[PDB]
Amino acid sequence: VNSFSGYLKLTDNVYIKNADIVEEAKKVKPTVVVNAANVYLKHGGGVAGALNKATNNAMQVESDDYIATNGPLKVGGSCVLSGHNLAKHCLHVVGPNVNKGEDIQLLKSAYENFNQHEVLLAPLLSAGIFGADPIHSLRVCVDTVRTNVYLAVFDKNLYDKLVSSFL
Numbered sequence: 018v019n020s021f022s023g024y025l026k027l028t029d030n031v032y033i034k035n036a037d038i039v040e041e042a043k044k045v046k047p048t049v050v051v052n053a054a055n056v057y058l059k060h061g062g063g064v065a066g067a068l069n070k071a072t073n074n075a076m077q078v079e080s081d082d083y084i085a086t087n088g089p090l091k092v093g094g095s096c097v098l099s100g101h102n103l104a105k106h107c108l109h110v111v112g113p114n115v116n117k118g119e120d121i122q123l124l125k126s127a128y129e130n131f132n133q134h135e136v137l138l139a140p141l142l143s144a145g146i147f148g149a150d151p152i153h154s155l156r157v158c159v160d161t162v163r164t165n166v167y168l169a170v171f172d173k174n175l176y177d178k179l180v181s182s183f184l
């Protein structure tokens with residue numbers, strides 16, 4: 018049993034809810050929250066900007082030190098950093114950004130990072146300002162992630178379309 022409430026069950030392991038991931042993280046304090054990161058861990062907008070704002074910029078400060086030591090992530094890659102006030106850990110995952118011309122086949126590699134964690138609160142990778150089709154992102158998620166994933170979808174309209182169209 019876990020703390021996640023109000024989710025619709027899509028599969029054995031994937032759950033979905035219309036929710037602000039920031040407000041959900043604050044309520045649940047999950048072991049892992051996933052950030053929709055870029056390779057530079059520059060948390061300007063989208064999910065990353067919202068998560069970082071909720072940490073009062075402490076996520077960005079920590080991220081800048083990580084990049085200064087390790088250099089950029091790979092598209093499809095990830096790193097584990099602090100969850101600050103939102104979670105125990107933040108898994109920063111880089112999905113391909115279609116608005117930069119990245120290979121959408123890298124979305125499966127991105128989701129494979131989730132399998133290193135038994136339970137996660139996450140957004141749909143490469144959705145929103147990353148430019149991918151969220152319906153496709155949900156399909157790759159279900160077909161790739163084997164661990165227990167709780168997806169937060171900010172937009173109610175999109176949430177209802179994801180559920181109604183789910184095979």
Ligand SMILES: O=C1Cc2ccccc2N1
Nearest residue numbers: 144145146151172174175
């Ligand atoms: O609110 C939103 C923003 C967006 C981008 C692409 C597809 C669906 C949606 N819903």
